[PDB]
């Protein structure tokens, strides 16, 4: 029987949560995917020789209090906190997603990876060192990815699974 990893992809609308998830599932870049769709995406994978199932929740903006967001935060075992390297505001929002997860879990240590998406884009606004420094302060990995060219997409999810395994082992 296969271990199922419940992963949640969080971050400001338009950073590429859906593109990243679809890239992992379908090996395809979507130019557009309806920004209001919050749904689960499953994939059977082998990570470091572990045959397992990834149950990935790709999330939507919710401006006010959301009982269902709280419940996914309670349920999720690992979180990809995604910003876009060309969007400073999405980077600044990261701290708010991390705080919310921690408050819901009532825990300062929760499996998480920081993801800087759209690494293919030549015009960056968020310095790598700045993002790396933040990750260091949180004690989590930092990966730069491109849903468009597939750069580090597997790496980002697989790293998160590694973070979940190590929390336990
Ligand atoms: N797009 C439509 C159909 C799905 C629906 N939806 C989101 C999918 C819920 C998937 C079950 N689930 C969860 S949590 C969760 C996690 Cl942490 C990881 C992987 C999961 O599959 C998962 N189900 S749940 O009851 O907490 C939940 C939370 C938020 C939601 O938007 C929904 C369900 C939901 O209604 C939203 C409307
Ligand atoms: N250039 C580039 N664009 C991307 C990347 N990921 C997403 N996008 C685009 O950014 C926009 C928002 O992506 P989407 O996946 O819907 O983000 P979500 O709201 O966070 O789900 C869409 O136009 C995507 O095509 C990437 O790695 N590189
Ligand atoms: Mg989306």
Swiss-Prot record:
Changing residue 15 to I: In NS3; affects activity and impairs responsiveness to GTPase activating proteins; characterized by a strong increase of both intrinsic and guanine nucleotide exchanged factor-catalyzed nucleotide exchange leading to an increased level of the activated state. The modification N6-acetyllysine is found at residue 105. GO terms for cellular component: cytoplasm; cytoplasmic side of plasma membrane; cytosol; endoplasmic reticulum membrane; focal adhesion; Golgi membrane; membrane; mitochondrial outer membrane. The keyword Cell membrane applies. Changing residue 13 to A: In colorectal cancer samples; somatic mutation. CDD domains: H_N_K_Ras_like. Changing residue 62 to R: In a colorectal cancer sample; somatic mutation; promotes interaction with SHOC2 and PP1C. Changing residue 60 to T: In GASC; also found in bladder cancer; somatic mutation. PROSITE patterns: RAS (PS51421). GTP binds at residues 11-19, 30-36, 60-61, 117-120. GO terms for molecular function: G protein activity; GDP binding; GMP binding; GTP binding; GTPase activity; identical protein binding; LRR domain binding; protein-containing complex binding. Acetylation at Lys-105 prevents interaction with guanine nucleotide exchange factors (GEFs). Lysine-depalmitoylation by SIRT2 promotes its localization to endomembranes in endocytic pathways. Changing residue 62 to L: Promotes GTP binding. Its main location: membrane. The modification N-acetylmethionine is found at residue 2. It catalyses: GTP + H2O = GDP + phosphate + H(+). Gene3D superfamilies: P-loop containing nucleotide triphosphate hydrolases (3.40.50.300). Disulfide bonds: none annotated. Changing residue 23 to R: In NS3; impairs GTPase-activating protein stimulated GTP hydrolysis with unaffected intrinsic functions and a virtually functional effector interaction. InterPro entries: P-loop_NTPase, Small_GTP-bd, Small_GTPase, Small_GTPase_Ras-type. It is found in: Cell membrane; Endomembrane system; Cytoplasm, Cytosol. NCBIfam families: small_GTP. Interacts with PHLPP. Interacts (active GTP-bound form preferentially) with RGS14. Interacts (when farnesylated) with PDE6D; this promotes dissociation from the cell membrane. Interacts with SOS1. Interacts (when farnesylated) with GPR31. Interacts with RAP1GDS1. Interacts (active GTP-bound form) with both SHOC2 and PP1c (all isoforms) to form a tertiary complex; SHOC2 and PP1c preferably bind M-Ras/MRAS, but they also bind K-Ras/KRAS, N-Ras/NRAS and H-Ras/HRAS. Interacts (GTP-bound form) with MAPKAP1/SIN1; inhibiting K-Ras/KRAS activity. It is linked to Leukemia, acute myelogenous: A subtype of acute leukemia, a cancer of the white blood cells. AML is a malignant disease of bone marrow characterized by maturational arrest of hematopoietic precursors at an early stage of development. Clonal expansion of myeloid blasts occurs in bone marrow, blood, and other tissue. Myelogenous leukemias develop from changes in cells that normally produce neutrophils, basophils, eosinophils and monocytes. Leukemia, juvenile myelomonocytic: An aggressive pediatric myelodysplastic syndrome/myeloproliferative disorder characterized by malignant transformation in the hematopoietic stem cell compartment with proliferation of differentiated progeny. Patients have splenomegaly, enlarged lymph nodes, rashes, and hemorrhages. Ras proteins bind GDP/GTP and possess intrinsic GTPase activity. Plays an important role in the regulation of cell proliferation. Plays a role in promoting oncogenic events by inducing transcriptional silencing of tumor suppressor genes (TSGs) in colorectal cancer (CRC) cells in a ZNF304-dependent manner. This is GTPase KRas. It comes from Homo sapiens (Human).
